[PDB]
């Protein structure tokens, strides 16, 4: 148990407010759509699996993308190049050894040159002002997990899963802080596996009541419910693997009891 769980959590809550993408950004983009962002992120999940990257890199990459898209207009034909350079940057930040830049060229089918990927890396860094250490759903999940009684593998996996699904859909998820999404996803995963609930420990640490989580939860319960129908499926395929105790197969509950 840390001396600074508390200091870290506190500080992560300070930083997420600052590292927030604009809410309405996608409506101000002439040429791109929430549905393209979704195709883009879903693809990034596959890239993550294919190179065996950590889940945190994935989350980091989506943060970069959304902040980038919040100050720069992008054309359909460049979106994938933003994504690619984000995933590279994220890999550099978070992975022990990142894939070689060429791999990054390869995963697009040579549709951009290495030099284009390297200058978009530079452009991303400058727009983000080298501010890469963004708080994620994944980080807040990991803190929250310290408060389970007792630790439940399936719950951890299934909360991860729910957290990732939320990356896919700007849709609604853009208007929640990561600390809130991770709250909702921890509850929903808890509830789903045991019937248990968002614990007083965390109610006190986070100062989030279950009530306060209601709107996010409702949205996330919907997303969970329709997940097998969603146009994007990369995260479900990912979360079938036994690595994750197959949780994305388990049957979501059809009401939440709120």
């Amino acid at each position: 148990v840390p001396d600074y769980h508390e200091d870290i959590h506190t500080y992560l809550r300070e930083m997420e407010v600052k590292c927030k993408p604009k809410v309405g950004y996608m409506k101000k983009q002439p040429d791109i759509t929430n549905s393209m962002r979704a195709i883009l992120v879903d693809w990034l999940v596959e890239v993550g699996e294919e190179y065996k990257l950590q889940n945190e890199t994935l989350h980091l990459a989506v943060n970069y993308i959304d902040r980038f898209l919040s100050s720069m207009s992008v054309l359909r034909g460049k979106l994938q190049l933003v994504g690619t350079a984000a995933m590279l940057l994220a890999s550099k930040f978070e992975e022990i050894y990142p894939p070689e830049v060429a791999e990054f060229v390869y995963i697009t089918d040579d549709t951009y040159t290495k030099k284009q990927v390297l200058r978009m890396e530079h452009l991303v860094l400058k727009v983000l002002t080298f501010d890469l250490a963004a708080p994620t759903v994944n980080q807040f999940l990991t803190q929250y997990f310290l408060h389970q009684q007792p630790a439940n593998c399936k719950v951890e996996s299934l909360a991860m899963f729910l957290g990732e699904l939320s990356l896919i859909d700007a849709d609604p998820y853009l208007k929640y802080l990561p600390s809130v999404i991770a709250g909702a996803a921890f509850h929903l995963a808890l509830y789903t596996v045991t019937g248990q609930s968002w614990p007083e420990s965390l109610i006190r640490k986070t100062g989030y009541t279950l009530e306060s989580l209601k709107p996010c939860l409702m949205d996330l319960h919907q997303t969970y419910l329709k997940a097998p129908q969603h146009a994007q499926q990369s995260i479900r395929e990912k979360y079938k693997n036994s690595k994750y105790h197959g949780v994305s197969l388990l049957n979501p509950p059809e009401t939440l009891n709120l």
């Binding site: 791109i32 195709i39 883009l40 693809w43 034909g77 979106l79 994938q80 697009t108 089918d109 549709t111």
Partner: peptide, 5 residues
Amino acid sequence: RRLNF
């Protein structure tokens, strides 16, 4: 893949 938008 190229992403066809």
